[PDB]
Every structure is written in structure tokens, then in C-alpha cells.
Curated annotation (Swiss-Prot):
Keyword Nucleus: yes
UniProt record similarity statement: Belongs to the ubiquitin-conjugating enzyme family.
InterPro entries the record matches: Ub_conjugating_enzyme, UBQ-conjugat_E2_core, UBQ-conjugating_AS, UBQ-conjugating_enzyme/RWD
Active site: 88
GO function terms (MF aspect): ATP binding; ubiquitin conjugating enzyme activity; ubiquitin protein ligase binding; ubiquitin-protein transferase activity
Record keywords: ATP-binding, Cell membrane, DNA damage, DNA repair, Membrane, Nucleotide-binding, Nucleus, Transferase, Ubl conjugation pathway
Catalytic EC class: transferase
Protein name (record): Ubiquitin-conjugating enzyme E2 B
Pathway connected to this protein: Protein modification; protein ubiquitination
Amino acid sequence: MSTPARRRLMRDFKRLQEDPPVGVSGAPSENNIMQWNAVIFGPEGTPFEDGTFKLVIEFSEEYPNKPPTVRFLSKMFHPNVYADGSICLDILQNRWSPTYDVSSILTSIQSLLDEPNPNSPANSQAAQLYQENKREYEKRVSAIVEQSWNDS
């Protein structure tokens, strides 16, 4: 029924309103405290700067420091992605510190767009094309972005 992990999430939300992260947003809209609504925009000086990407962060009633779960709602091509669509970040592991806030997870992925980690990539196909054929990779970026570029 109740838990400590839930209470913490409530303290983070109010703290988010006081001073939310610039460039990325992550707050619950209609979905319960479990599911949240977050969106990340491409960094400056990248083919994603003009594009828009939305992602959801699924929390668990396990522990306030237990490795959470996150995944993009829109199916797009990325240099590194899991079969479930999750993102490969050091935060996803036990390296996550209970000192930081949810904003840290939003900025973590934002920076990933700028430059991924060649250290054990999830999608070798993309990571390879990045150093092989840039013309083939760029087309994949603008293509996936165009789909979620305009919905109206």
C-alpha cells in the first residue's frame, strides 16, 4: 500500500517545480506517480537540436536507490539501445547515487546524444557506420527525427 520510495518521489516533484532542469523536462502529468512524462531535446550543435524526443521513466516501489527503468516512447534509431528500448548509462547500474535527483537522469541521456560511449556499444551497426560512412548515418538521423518532428 505505502512505501518510502514513493514519499521520496513526492519530495522530488515539488523540488522540480522550484527549479527544473533547463533543456529537459521530467514530471508526472496524468499518469500516476509510477509513470512520469519527460522530454529531451537535442543538444546545441547537433542534428537533434532541431528535433524532439520524448521518453518515459518507470519507477519501482523497491527502494529510493534501486536502479530505476527508463525508455523512449518513440521508436528511433540510436548508436546504442537495448532490446527493450532502454538506454545504456552508468546511472542505470548501481553507480546511481541517492544524492542526485531525477534531473540527473534527464541530463544523462541528453549528453548521450552529443557523444556516446564507444566502450561496449549496444548497437554495433550504428557505432560502426559512425566511423565508416557518415553519409549513411546522417540520413538515419534526419529520417527518424522527421517522423517525430511534426505531428500536427
